[PDB]
Design a protein around this ligand. Sequence first.
Ligand SMILES: [Ca+2]
Ligand SMILES: [Ca+2]
Ligand SMILES: [Ca+2]
Ligand SMILES: [Ca+2]
Length: 289
Amino acid sequence: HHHHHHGSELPQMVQQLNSPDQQELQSALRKLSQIASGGNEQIQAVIDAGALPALVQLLSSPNEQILQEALWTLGNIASGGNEQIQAVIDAGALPALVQLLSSPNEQILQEALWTLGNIASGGNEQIQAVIDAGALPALVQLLSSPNEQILQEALWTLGNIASGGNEQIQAVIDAGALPALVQLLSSPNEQILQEALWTLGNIASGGNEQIQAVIDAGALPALVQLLSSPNEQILQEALWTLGNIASGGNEQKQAVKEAGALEKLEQLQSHENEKIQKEAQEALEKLQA
Ligand SMILES: [Ca+2]
Ligand SMILES: [Ca+2]
Ligand SMILES: [Ca+2]
Ligand SMILES: [Ca+2]
């Protein structure tokens, strides 16, 4: 695409977000979307022309075509810099997004989850905003969803929250994530297993309190069993997750040994796949530190 020195064209587009001509409205919405799918400089032009408050307000539209595109514009803006994410938060996006997590329209629901995930990919300030807006309860509930597509989205958003500081991880734990995540570890669906492990491993990246909650919820037997998975990605993920657990205190280390991990970690050091050899030796190092 093409360079454009954004002048009064943008502000006029933002104003047409109010147009009673839904054709003119949609047209402007699409152009704002396209611009926000560019780099940070383009994203910044959209923010600086005042688009955010009107986009956020469109999240209460009863017109799904408008709503879905505004959500998409917001999600793109939130895929930029932390200060861009923070502009979306300041404009009031979070409560409207959290509301949408109860939508029975799976397209809107996915898009809200996606937008939330992008906001939660920012710094700990952005993550804390998501927690404070009350997103956790809905996210945790979606862990029991029979909808694999919604489930993966929810898992990615929770995983993002769980990659923050220890208190942010602890909020995820306090909202009850762990039992549903532990149960996912018995899924026959390896794609789900991979996604659940990404999220659980982040939780296990916390401090000893957070690690002990993982052990308390029953994670270890399921993890240890996945060290025999024939899928090598899963095998990698479970090593990574166990290593994180292993890096805690003596109490945490002892739990890992009691669950039988030590012997498995040792054999996997010789695995054919180098990525596994490396994850295994690094998990063993953590345990044995
Ligand atoms: Ca409608
Ligand atoms: Ca539906
Ligand atoms: Ca299904
Ligand atoms: Ca399977």
